[PDB]
Amino acid sequence: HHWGYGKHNGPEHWHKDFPIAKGERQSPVDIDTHTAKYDPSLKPLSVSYDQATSLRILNNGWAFNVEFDDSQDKAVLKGGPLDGTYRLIQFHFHWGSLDGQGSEHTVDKKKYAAELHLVHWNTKYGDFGKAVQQPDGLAVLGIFLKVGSAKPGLQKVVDVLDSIKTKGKSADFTNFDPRGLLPESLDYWTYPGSLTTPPLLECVTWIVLKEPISVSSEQVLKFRKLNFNGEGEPEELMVDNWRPAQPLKNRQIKASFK
Numbered sequence: 001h002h003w004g005y006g007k008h009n010g011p012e013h014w015h016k017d018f019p020i021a022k023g024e025r026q027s028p029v030d031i032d033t034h035t036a037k038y039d040p041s042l043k044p045l046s047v048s049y050d051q052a053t054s055l056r057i058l059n060n061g062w063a064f065n066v067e068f069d070d071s072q073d074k075a076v077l078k079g080g081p082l083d084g085t086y087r088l089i090q091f092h093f094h095w096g097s098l099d100g101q102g103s104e105h106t107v108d109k110k111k112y113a114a115e116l117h118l119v120h121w122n123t124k125y126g127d128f129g130k131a132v133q134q135p136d137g138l139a140v141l142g143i144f145l146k147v148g149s150a151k152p153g154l155q156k157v158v159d160v161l162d163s164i165k166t167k168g169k170s171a172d173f174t175n176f177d178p179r180g181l182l183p184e185s186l187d188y189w190t191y192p193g194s195l196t197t198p199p200l201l202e203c204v205t206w207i208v209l210k211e212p213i214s215v216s217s218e219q220v221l222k223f224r225k226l227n228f229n230g231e232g233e234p235e236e237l238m239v240d241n242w243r244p245a246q247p248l249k250n251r252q253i254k255a256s257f258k
C-alpha cells in the first residue's frame with residue numbers, strides 16, 4: 001500500500017507518510033494573476049536545450065518520464081530567478097480524465113487539461129540526489145496544456161505510449177528534442193515550492209510559463225490510455241494524476257512580465 005491518486009491513497013492521504021505535505025512551501029498553488037507582482041530584479045530566462053540528449057521513456061505508475069543524459073551540461077536552464085546552472089534530468093506530465101481538469105498549478109482557479117514539468121537540478125550540488133536535499137536544489141519549468149490544435153513536437157512521445165502502457169515498462173527514446181514542447185513566449189511566474197509527488201521535498205524553485213501549448217484531443221486521449229497498474233493486473237486508467245493547489249502561506253508569486 002503506497003501513495004497514489006485514488007480515493008484511499010490520494011493527495012489527501014500523503015501527509016501520513018510525508019508530514020511535509022502540510023509544510024510551508026508546498027506545490028502546486030493557485031496563481032492569482034492580479035496579486036502576482038512584476039519583479040524588475042528577475043534576469044532574462046535562459047532555456048538552452050539545443051544539445052539535449054534523451055535516452056528513455058518509462059511509466060513509473062504515477063506518470064511517464066522522458067529521461068535525459070545529465071552526465072554533462074547539454075540541456076540547461078539559467079537566468080530568471082535562478083542563480084547558476086540547472087541541468088535537465090527528465091520531464092513528465094500531469095493530465096485529467098476530462099479536458100476541464102488535469103493541471104496542478106491553476107491560474108485564477110482555472111484548471112488546464114494538463115501540465116508539463118521539465119525537471120532540472122542545480123549543478124553546484126553534484127547530483128540529483130544531493131540537490132533535492134537543498135532549498136534551491138531543483139528548478140522545474142511548468143507549461144500548461146490546453147486542447148485545440150495538435151502539437152507537432154509532442155507526437156513522437158504520443159507514438160511510443162503504446163509500448164509502455166503499464167507500470168514498470170520503459171522504451172528507448174533517443175534523439176527527442178524538448179524544444180518542440182515550448183510555447184512562443186517565455187513570460188512566467190516564479191515562486192519557491194516543492195515536488196508535487198512524494199516525498200514532496202521543498203527544494204523547488206518554480207517557473208510556470210504564462211502561455212500554454214495547444215495539443216489535439218487525439219493526443220491527450222492517448223495519454224489517458226496509459227495504466228497506473230502493472231501488466232497483467234486489473235486495468236486502472238492513468239488519469240487525474242495531479243495534486244490539487246496547496247496553501248500559499250508566507251509566499252509571493254513574482255511575474256517576469258507586465
Ligand SMILES: [Zn+2]
Binds near residue numbers: 092093094117196
Ligand atoms: Zn510533475
